[PDB]
Design a protein around this ligand. Structure first.
Ligand SMILES: *[C@@H]1O[C@H](CO)[C@@H](O)[C@H](O)[C@H]1NC(C)=O
Lengths: 39, 49
C-alpha cells in the first residue's frame, strides 16, 4: 500500500493493532520505545 | 483417510505458493478482475506503452 517511513520492520507476528495495508500492521512496542511494523 | 470420503479437492496443496484448493483455483480464475490499483501502478503509468 505504498511505503512506510518511521517504523522498523520486524520478523515477528502479533495481533493487529493499527492496520496499514495488505497484511501489514503497526504497533508501539518496548523491544527502547519505538514504532514497529510487522505482518 | 476419512472413512472413504474424498476431500482432496477442497483441502489445500503445498505445490503452489498461494495455498489454495482446486475448487478455489477454479473460482479465482473464473471471475475476471478489473485490475484495480490495489497494487501500485504509477511505474506502469509512467511508461507509456
Ligand atoms: C480420490 O481419492 C484418491 C485416493 O484414494 C485420489 O487418488 C484421487 O485423486 C481422489 N479423487 C480426486 C478427483 O482427486
Amino acid at each position: 500500500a505504498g511505503c512506510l517511513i518511521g517504523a522498523e520492520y520486524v520478523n515477528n507476528s502479533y495481533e493487529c493493532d493499527i492496520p496499514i495495508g495488505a497484511g501489514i500492521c503497526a504497533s508501539y512496542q518496548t523491544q527502547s520505545q519505538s514504532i514497529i511494523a510487522y505482518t | 483417510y476419512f472413512g472413504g470420503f474424498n476431500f482432496s479437492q477442497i483441502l489445500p496443496d503445498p505445490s503452489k505458493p498461494s495455498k489454495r484448493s482446486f475448487i478455489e483455483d477454479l473460482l479465482f480464475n473464473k471471475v475476471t478482475l478489473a485490475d484495480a490499483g490495489f497494487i501500485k501502478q504509477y511505474g506502469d503509468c509512467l511508461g507509456d506503452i
